[PDB]
Amino acid sequence: KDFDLIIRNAYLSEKDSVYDIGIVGDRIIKIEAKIEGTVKDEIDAKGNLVSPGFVDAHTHMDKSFTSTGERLPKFWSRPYTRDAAIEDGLKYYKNATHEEIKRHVIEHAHMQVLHGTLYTRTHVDVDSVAKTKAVEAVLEAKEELKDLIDIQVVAFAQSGFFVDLESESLIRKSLDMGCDLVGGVDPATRENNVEGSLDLCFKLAKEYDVDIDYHIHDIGTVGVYSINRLAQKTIENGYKGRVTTSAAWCFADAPSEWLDEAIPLYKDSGMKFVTCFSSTPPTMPVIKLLEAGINLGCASDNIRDFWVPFGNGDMVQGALIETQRLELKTNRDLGLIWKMITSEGARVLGIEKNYGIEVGKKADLVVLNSLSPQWAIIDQAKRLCVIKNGRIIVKDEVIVA
Amino acid sequence: SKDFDLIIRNAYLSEKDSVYDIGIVGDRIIKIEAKIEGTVKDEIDAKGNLVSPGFVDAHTHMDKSFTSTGERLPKFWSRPYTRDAAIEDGLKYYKNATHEEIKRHVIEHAHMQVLHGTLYTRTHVDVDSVAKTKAVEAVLEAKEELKDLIDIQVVAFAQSGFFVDLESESLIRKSLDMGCDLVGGVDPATRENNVEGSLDLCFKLAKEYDVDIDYHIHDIGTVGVYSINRLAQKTIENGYKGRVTTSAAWCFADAPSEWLDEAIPLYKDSGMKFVTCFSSTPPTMPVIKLLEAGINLGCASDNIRDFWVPFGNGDMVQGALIETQRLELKTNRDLGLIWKMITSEGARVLGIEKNYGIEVGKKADLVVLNSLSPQWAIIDQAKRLCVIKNGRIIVKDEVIVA
Ligand SMILES: [Cl-]
Ligand SMILES: [Cl-]
Ligand SMILES: [Zn+2]
Ligand SMILES: [Zn+2]
């Protein structure tokens, strides 16, 4: 047979036209207006958009779905604060079992792939109560999920290196077990030590030769200062391109000149950013960052836990949410959000060379039931088909792997 | 003696916080009991999930909906939104639009709404020197054909402005004579350039036909609040307490909070009602604060897939999620207030509250959801299982079966 799989009549946004896509093994081999040749399996996209797999660049798979089980979501009789949610986590992880955490990770991943997400980066709580229990469960589930979704795992010091003093050794072990990145939280308002927390993070990252993903939620000028120190140390440590800042809410309320001043530093350091659609501030300068050529991905953040009650693991839904948070309507702007859930995310994850609907790239694709990125955001139609490693894994809302 | 025309089994009801069977005869709820003895022909098992009254989309523009559709990309959206440019696109559209095209759009809009469990809506219809009464005629006609699916109130809406399009006054009078249910205008300040005159004219017309009022006030900041204050004061002077709605009211987001604090007693004294549309609700809109003060605040789609708003699925449960995200809400209490906005607050805006709710004696207009509670429905966005209007099943598993 000439192709293992052909997708017929696929509208491709980057080319602005309709094409047949021919696939062999896990690779795209041919993209032509009409493909002749024999073929084992076919999918007709019927003139609708086919897209690369969506990238959910920031999740917490380990503690997901912990709000579920009752008539009302658990934990949400009281308002959100970072420190209270940290406490709920310590209480939860005290009695949580390896199998419960694993089941949550798998459930999370299944929900993501049903919505066309084929790549994700998850953080995992590492602290003196969870120890490496969560890491173990996540790494194990990651192995079992290889044929559905690619997962990068961040060893994440949720309590703070200088607040939970067991964090440093537990993170080292976590990275020794095979976590892919390392990260901390709020060098200023959580750690009370910007220089020390950041320096420690880089030391650990260099010991295991891993990339960095840091949670910086601190608002205003203290947030921007924290990210500036991060970016400066990124350069000093020879880590250009290897560092991600997650959240960065501070760009919304810090004076705009602080961001204007910092952009060249972020470009020089190759700083990457992820904004999560469960918290992106309505005045976040998302479009401005993209127009400046800053690499900005998008993400679910927490799903149905003591941090965020919401979540469907659906990046197309997240795109709609972002348009509404940021008050966007033009085709251009909706197109930039679509980039955020696709090619920007790929770039954050470091997989851009293998990402996209181009000959030679990975056959990880989503056939949608809408005509274009803009219409898919607007109409929220369910995914028709999902393809991973050139194999069909989702058809009409069902996992068929 | 006679037996139920319809029973819904195992219905979780939010106001009672328990699971009940619901028995229906004709268009009315007759019995709500833990177990209704005996079987009937037409039954629906809710399987322990939430059953809710029909959702209220308290503000739509059915007449010009879906005009953005037809191509690979949405039409009209190569340029950013401004009120005045969208007014121009409308005048251009209505020049060549046919009675049948407008009607088809209205029906398509309504079908999309009922598929998502909306059983009551208030739509505005452009009345101006280009549309004339063509849109009104089409909407009133479609409204008659849709009675078994959805209740529609129709606002004769002077979109161009009474003092900008001078043919508006006479066209509105005929529109109301044809049977529109309410009258309204737009932006007394920045569109009409005449706050006293536009408002006084609107009340004169409203009194001539004994209809209620729904005014679009999109003007931001203190000019918006001033406009609404004048509206509320004239509401009292004209003996129209309870008969006036202010749509949008974006100005409450950016006007100083002490302006809203000062105005609240006036709004209560006038019985002013408000609608915020989830396609534009400003992120700092004091939604919770208005509700906690006992102000009546409903929710709505606004435009769907046109030259004003490209978005829209006519789905109030989706709108609820959008509002939680716009306003940064997470607590069960706050999500519960948003659910009130898409149900009982909307009913109150529309004036149907005496017949609205899952209570014995009320209208059997209901939605069976695939989620456990208002909060979980907002979060998980599951499709509607069943929709019931006038005690008859009209939607089953994403299909209109009426
Ligand atoms: Cl410091
Ligand atoms: Cl005036
Ligand atoms: Zn996070
Ligand atoms: Zn409107």
Numbering used by the authors:
A (entry chain A): 3 to 403
B (entry chain B): 2 to 403
Verbatim from the authors:
AtzC is a member of amidohydrolase protein superfamily and is the third enzyme of the atrazine mineralization pathway. AtzC is a tetramer, according to PISA, our SEC data (native molecular mass of ~210 kDa), and previous reports, with the asymmetric unit containing half of the tetrameric structure. The second and larger domain which contains the active site is a TIM-barrel fold. The active sites of the independently solved structures show similar architectures, each having three histidine residues coordinated to the zinc ion (His60, His62, His217; 2.1 to 2.3 Å) as well as Asp303 (about 2.4 Å) and a water (2.0 to 2.1 Å) bound to the zinc.
The malonate (a poor inhibitor of AtzC) adopts a planar conformation in the structure and packs against Trp309 (less than 3.5 Å away) as well as interacting with Lys65, Gln160, His219 and Asn304 (2.8–2.9 Å, ~3.2 Å, 2.6–2.7 Å and 2.5 to 3.0 Å, respectively). Oxygen atoms from both carboxylates of malonate are within hydrogen bonding distance of the water bound to zinc (2.4 to 2.8 Å) for both instances in the asymmetric unit. The bound water is also within 2.7 Å of His249 and Asp303 as well as close to the bound malonate moiety. Although malonate is a weak inhibitor of AtzC, the high malonate concentration used in the crystallization trials likely prevented other small molecules from binding in the active site.
